[PDB]
Amino acid sequence: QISVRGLAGVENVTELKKNFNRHLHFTLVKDRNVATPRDYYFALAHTVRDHLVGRWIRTQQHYYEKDPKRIYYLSLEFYMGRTLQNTMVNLALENACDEATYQLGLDMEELEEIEEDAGLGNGGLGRLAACFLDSMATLGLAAYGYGIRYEFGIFNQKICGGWQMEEADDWLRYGNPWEKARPEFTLPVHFYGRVEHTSQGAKWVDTQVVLAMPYDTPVPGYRNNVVNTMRLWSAKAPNDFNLGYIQAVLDRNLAENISRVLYPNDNFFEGKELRLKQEYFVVAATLQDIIRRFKSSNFDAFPDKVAIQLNDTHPSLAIPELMRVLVDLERLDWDKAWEVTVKTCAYTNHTVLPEALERWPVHLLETLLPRHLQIIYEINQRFLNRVAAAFPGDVDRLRRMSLVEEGAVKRINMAHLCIAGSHAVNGVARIHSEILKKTIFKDFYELEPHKFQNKTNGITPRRWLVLCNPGLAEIIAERIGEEYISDLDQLRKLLSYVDDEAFIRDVAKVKQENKLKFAAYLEREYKVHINPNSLFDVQVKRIHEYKRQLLNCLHVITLYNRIKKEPNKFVVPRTVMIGGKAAPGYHMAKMIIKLITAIGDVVNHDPVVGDRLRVIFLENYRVSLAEKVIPAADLSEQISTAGTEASGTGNMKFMLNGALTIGTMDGANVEMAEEAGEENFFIFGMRVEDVDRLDQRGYNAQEYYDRIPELRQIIEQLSSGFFSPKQPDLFKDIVNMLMHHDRFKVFADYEEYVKCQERVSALYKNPREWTRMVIRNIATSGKFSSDRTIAQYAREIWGVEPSRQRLPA
Amino acid sequence: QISVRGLAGVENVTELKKNFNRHLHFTLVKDRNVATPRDYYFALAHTVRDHLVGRWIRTQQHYYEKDPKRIYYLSLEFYMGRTLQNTMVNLALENACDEATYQLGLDMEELEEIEEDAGLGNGGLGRLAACFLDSMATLGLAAYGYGIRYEFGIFNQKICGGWQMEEADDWLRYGNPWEKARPEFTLPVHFYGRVEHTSQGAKWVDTQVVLAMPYDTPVPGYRNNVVNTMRLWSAKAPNDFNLGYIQAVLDRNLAENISRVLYPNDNFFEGKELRLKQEYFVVAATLQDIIRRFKSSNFDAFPDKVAIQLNDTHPSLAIPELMRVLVDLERLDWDKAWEVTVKTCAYTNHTVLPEALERWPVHLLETLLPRHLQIIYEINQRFLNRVAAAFPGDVDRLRRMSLVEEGAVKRINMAHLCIAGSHAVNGVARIHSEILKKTIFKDFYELEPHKFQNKTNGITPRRWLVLCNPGLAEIIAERIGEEYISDLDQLRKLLSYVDDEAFIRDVAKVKQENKLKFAAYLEREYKVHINPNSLFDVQVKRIHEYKRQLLNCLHVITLYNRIKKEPNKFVVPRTVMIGGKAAPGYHMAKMIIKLITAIGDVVNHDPVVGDRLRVIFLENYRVSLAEKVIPAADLSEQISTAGTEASGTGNMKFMLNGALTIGTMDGANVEMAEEAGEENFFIFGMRVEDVDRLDQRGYNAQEYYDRIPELRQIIEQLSSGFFSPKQPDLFKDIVNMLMHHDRFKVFADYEEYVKCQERVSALYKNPREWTRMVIRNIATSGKFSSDRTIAQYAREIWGVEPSRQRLPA
Numbered sequence A, B: 001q002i003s004v005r006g007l008a009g010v011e012n013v014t015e016l017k018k019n020f021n022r023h024l025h026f027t028l029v030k031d032r033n034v035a036t037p038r039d040y041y042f043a044l045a046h047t048v049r050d051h052l053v054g055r056w057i058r059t060q061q062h063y064y065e066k067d068p069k070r071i072y073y074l075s076l077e078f079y080m081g082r083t084l085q086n087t088m089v090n091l092a093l094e095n096a097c098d099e100a101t102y103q104l105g106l107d108m109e110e111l112e113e114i115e116e117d118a119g120l121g122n123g124g125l126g127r128l129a130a131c132f133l134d135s136m137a138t139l140g141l142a143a144y145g146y147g148i149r150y151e152f153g154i155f156n157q158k159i160c161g162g163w164q165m166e167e168a169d170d171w172l173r174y175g176n177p178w179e180k181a182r183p184e185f186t187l188p189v190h191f192y193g194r195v196e197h198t199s200q201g202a203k204w205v206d207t208q209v210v211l212a213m214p215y216d217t218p219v220p221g222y223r224n225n226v227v228n229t230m231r232l233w234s235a236k237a238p239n240d241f242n243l244g245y246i247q248a249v250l251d252r253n254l255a256e257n258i259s260r261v262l263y264p265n266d267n268f269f270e271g272k273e274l275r276l277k278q279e280y281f282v283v284a285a286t287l288q289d290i291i292r293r294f295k296s297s298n299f300d301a302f303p304d305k306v307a308i309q310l311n312d313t314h315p316s317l318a319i320p321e322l323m324r325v326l327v328d329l330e331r332l333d334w335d336k337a338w339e340v341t342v343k344t345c346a347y348t349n350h351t352v353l354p355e356a357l358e359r360w361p362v363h364l365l366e367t368l369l370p371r372h373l374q375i376i377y378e379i380n381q382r383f384l385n386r387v388a389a390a391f392p393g394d395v396d397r398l399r400r401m402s403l404v405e406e407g408a409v410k411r412i413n414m415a416h417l418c419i420a421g422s423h424a425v426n427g428v429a430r431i432h433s434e435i436l437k438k439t440i441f442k443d444f445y446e447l448e449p450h451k452f453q454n455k456t457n458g459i460t461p462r463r464w465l466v467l468c469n470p471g472l473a474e475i476i477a478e479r480i481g482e483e484y485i486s487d488l489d490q491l492r493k494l495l496s497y498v499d500d501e502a503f504i505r506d507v508a509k510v511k512q513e514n515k516l517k518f519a520a521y522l523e524r525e526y527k528v529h530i531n532p533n534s535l536f537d538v539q540v541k542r543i544h545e546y547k548r549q550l551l552n553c554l555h556v557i558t559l560y561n562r563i564k565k566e567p568n569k570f571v572v573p574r575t576v577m578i579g580g581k582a583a584p585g586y587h588m589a590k591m592i593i594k595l596i597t598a599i600g601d602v603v604n605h606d607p608v609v610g611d612r613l614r615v616i617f618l619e620n621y622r623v624s625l626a627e628k629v630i631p632a633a634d635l636s637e638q639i640s641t642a643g644t645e646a647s648g649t650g651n652m653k654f655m656l657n658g659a660l661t662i663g664t665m666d667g668a669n670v671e672m673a674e675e676a677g678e679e680n681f682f683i684f685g686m687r688v689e690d691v692d693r694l695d696q697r698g699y700n701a702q703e704y705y706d707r708i709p710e711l712r713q714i715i716e717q718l719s720s721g722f723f724s725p726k727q728p729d730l731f732k733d734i735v736n737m738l739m740h741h742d743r744f745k746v747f748a749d750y751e752e753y754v755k756c757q758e759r760v761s762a763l764y765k766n767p768r769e770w771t772r773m774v775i776r777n778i779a780t781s782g783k784f785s786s787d788r789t790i791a792q793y794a795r796e797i798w799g800v801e802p803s804r805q806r807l808p809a
């Protein structure tokens, strides 16, 4: 039907139909009389999977023959979403499968909705890993993603009485057709035990063993016949484990719990033993696999053949594990091993909030990983000796830079370990990388300036344009061809269409159709009823104080109060949508969700408001929901306190899909405005420098309450029970925090935010000029392709050259 | 190569080769360069499986169209063994697959050895269920086996220092290609809670829910294109289960533990809560499935369309569950529901030892299954009212027959429940069925004589002749054709060959080749070195006192002592092989294994003995080992105390495969001797009547020790440390039991056993007359086909007619 979706050849359609029927019969063991839509989904998934395997086998054979440098991307999170459509896109099979299924009497879009998300991450960090795998395959890199196969991913969110409830995400219940178990490559991982010193070095003995069984998932590049591998480890007990008899068998669950569940606490560190076990488990299995593959081609060449990228500090134990293997098992001297390790490892930092930093109690490492603690102490002493030689007499620097933190409980700072043991350290947007050098890692930058880099984040335009917004992809392809899908800088060519009346109309029509489709989805699956002519004002991301969903709430209540004050005045109609999950233990985040639904309960049923203002909490935000709502949005809310959002990536998804952005000069918002032009962005609020000046003087929220009558009215409404009639004090914790303990200065940006929102409403009244500004945003989004990001990692960190050349089919 | 293995057509071989290569590539995702023998096994299994599915779908569709009476065989155990060869046999594909794999450069027998046994049973009861499924498919019955999918089956036995060690049987580690998960037919099962009485009947409320997910395995009939289903349930927690957050997810394991592990204690009852949960779990899921299938065609017709066979009392909760469903949910009056239940259910008893009987504490049922306890009390009161009307004034009968046992702890006798609620009760051999009527169920027989039947056990001649002994099957087929494989009574025709010199030679040659093959297997996999010209004297079965492995040990030591006394006298050389697992908690059984290995340690290294006597403990006895050793045996040891082995089925396997039997007149041994003629059997020892007379007088083992010098010598050797030099008192528990507390009267049959063994040795010296007697055994083994057994259940209990007619391919 549409061009970017590829050819529907007669031979291809015929072959797909026969393979579909073959899988239904032989694989699923059904016939058409008993088959449900889920059976049909599985028959299609197996049919598409078959087209991957030839390319998968020949890619891995190709890497064996050519022996390129291998890139290992270690992450505790891979937020993959659904696989069926992405695979069809990358293999150019979408139109052929659409035709084949149509001829069999099925609707393919309906079958696509049956697939579960692979929700093996929390948010930005996990989804970045997923975009990165797609770009690495698309750029022809010999790359492997390594992680954990969690039995339960991020919880499903239900809203009950306005409150978040969590339920287990049993994503494997019906099977996962994309993975292949590889029980033959199972590897042992050791825990506990003790260290013995022989004449022939240290030995780690009397350990408990857990097995790591790998499952491999294919990662297709875009139309290049490259298929890379994501290998996820699953925990298994050995067969003599604990080996009354019955209890010993039931206790195997204790070992296997390592891979049971994803920790859902993001940007807040909890020193839990089970989490530490997960981190070591992925590192120990992965490194054995790396070394095996290297030997099946002298460790001096190891850094020429291996790169290990640490996605935050979560896999930081790779550093002392690599040392352990090289020194204890391979018998290299320390200095040689350290050289190899540093040249192999590189570390990406994703946050600056101090409570998010991993600082493990020494006593936990002592008991679980006694040899690793010894190695970390040795690393620390040698490192501090270099610091002392460079900055003689600076004793406070020695205590600041130490890997060991002294105090009530001694802790290991894993960020300091990563910097010491990596040849490169990067932040994820220009402003974040600068902040790392000027503040939290200042001392390290002064010692080793050459280590510190920037790699601004990006998103894959396969999933985040072609897949989720085919209408937009098509009207763009009509004008400039298809090459932009793997070379996103070509969207700059669209600037020559900013005055083209046909293009203006088509861009606006695509948005309108996306909005109608989403408005329909809402009624169907959630009995909620919205005006599709309203401005769609959207803030979707995990719930955190720093992201300031509360600032958005203050604006919504302001709009509501202004309507009630002058009900017969015209205002631009809005549908304000907020969605995202809260970490189960984070009380304030749970109260914020409740506040949002409470505001909706009042606003959405006030007859004077009519359909001029609606407030909807989007339940169970996840990758498959992002693919639906982002194409429908008019306004993207990116309103974190300046200096707190390291980059953001949702921001980039909205820009690519034809929404304008209201935001602070934070994370990648700075670079987005620089690319598009500040005139084409809705920037407001304090810059980082203004936040610093306020902290020096002392933030006093009372001052804002005293001087801004509209703000005072909202606080009095919250305090008095206007949004919670039966429980008048329900939101007192929120009010108390805002008035006395607000680390993120919500009131300080309120006045500027409301004024900026008025400028948004004014532009939206002129459809033609709104759409021209949109075109200027889409046209300058190219820098934010993860293909650009990965090309920079490849050349500046990993020392490998990307390639757009096809492998042969 | 051999005829009974079917045709190797050019078209068929070509098609098998292409499908094998297809699975290797697309299913396994390998190529020939990296593939291991296990990959090749899986490629073959998937290729053979594809030939099942068409027949499976069309069989189940056939039953839907024709709506025959359905037979539901409920068992906690299905001891299936390996599936690949059995499937090839039943589909006539063995020679074609042999050719196809040969042409691909692989040896099929080697690939067959890779498959794990499905060890979902302990021994005789579990293996009977498996033979029965094969016969039911072969006879065209619309039959379903229902059980539990244990994650861990019967443990793997390792022998360390002569002692049994248990390790977990992780049989699913590499996947199971034969099963199909059916998560779409998942059903809820309830536990705990409480009963509320409304005006509209009882209600069971506030329960905990566990989900039952079914996995279906195909069961092919012999060359009739029938493929029936074995449905095994797996326990899953619901997704709101327990729904700190982390602990709630980890605690899902508590629900899922129901299906984790097979209880390995056979013939000894332990009232464990987890076992009771397993029994209810299988019953509750199965009955919902039965009722659903019945409704998808008025409960008066239920017994016309449904038969439920209870394999011992393990699924006895079917009786009150069916009542619960009919009365509480469907609102039938009690009397009508009871009529339907009795006409639907039938019960097979498999033992007479009182410690094997299930007697559940009332307090466990009260807490776990409060509504079922109420129903059982009501059943009991109505039943005892009938007893009182039939035998007025007989108050002791009322207490003997009660389902409720009074005492320290009140218990429910599940055997009494089964008799009360079934229209038929059967034992498993003629002598056992008579014992049931005369002793343990005498009172019930007097009340309802029409209920009591016999169904003598049998074995499937597909697995237990064609599959495991193709050489024998072939020389038989040469003379009488192939029809005997599904009509085993035709082996009687072999009596006309008892004087045929060619047949005599071929029978003896087949045995010799089987012995050479087994002797080789021993060296290869277990570095043990035997004389293949010796008489192979074999006792394989679970280790129990009643089976008297100890009596065999006394004979072995007698032979050894006789050699040492007259070393230069000729004796017929023997290899004595004993194998079987002991229940983990059964101390005496563990000591018996140790004694057997201890005897071997002395005997096998005495240079004066040479290769005249060897004693080997066969480690990890299981179905796949039985298939190897039984064809190789000369002498089958079936030496239980008269009245203790309900039937035996190993006895029948040996008879069919050309071994002679030394045995007591116990279980099916009685019928085997009756069929073959007592002259052609080696019968010894007390009959049941003699055991009774000894018990009346009182068994005094000292008397035998005082009067039999050879026996006294052995006891002194055991006591003094002759078989345990470093631990002289190691076997004192054994000696103490034999001398003072022997329930099974080992000494009382010793003299007769030794004399009978001398008569065995004498016949073995005349190869020609040994072989003629063998022919007379094989020729009269037909009655012991499980096809005969199932035809009798069908006609006399289930009320359905068997059929040998092919369904169309």
Ligand SMILES: CCc1ccc([C@H](C)CC(=O)N[C@@H]2O[C@H](CO)[C@@H](O)[C@H](O)[C@H]2O)cc1
Pocket: A123, A124, A125, A126, A128, A265, A266, A267, A268, A269, A270, A312, A350, A351, A356, A357, A358, A428, A457, A645, A646, A647, A648, A649, A667
């Ligand atoms: C120790 C608990 C924990 C778990 C996860 C994390 C992640 C690093 C949180 C995260 O997702 N950070 C986000 O990373 C994205 C990809 O670089 C950025 O775009 C976001 O700005 C950043 O918040 C921190 C702490």
Ligand SMILES: CCc1ccc([C@H](C)CC(=O)N[C@@H]2O[C@H](CO)[C@@H](O)[C@H](O)[C@H]2O)cc1
Pocket: B123, B124, B125, B126, B128, B265, B266, B267, B268, B269, B270, B312, B350, B351, B356, B357, B358, B428, B457, B645, B646, B647, B648, B649, B667
């Ligand atoms: C409650 C523990 C428990 C578990 C299993 C059993 C089974 C009934 C034991 C068993 O396997 N009995 C055997 O059943 C075979 C099939 O009918 C007979 O051939 C054997 O004689 C009988 O011992 C009893 C008690």
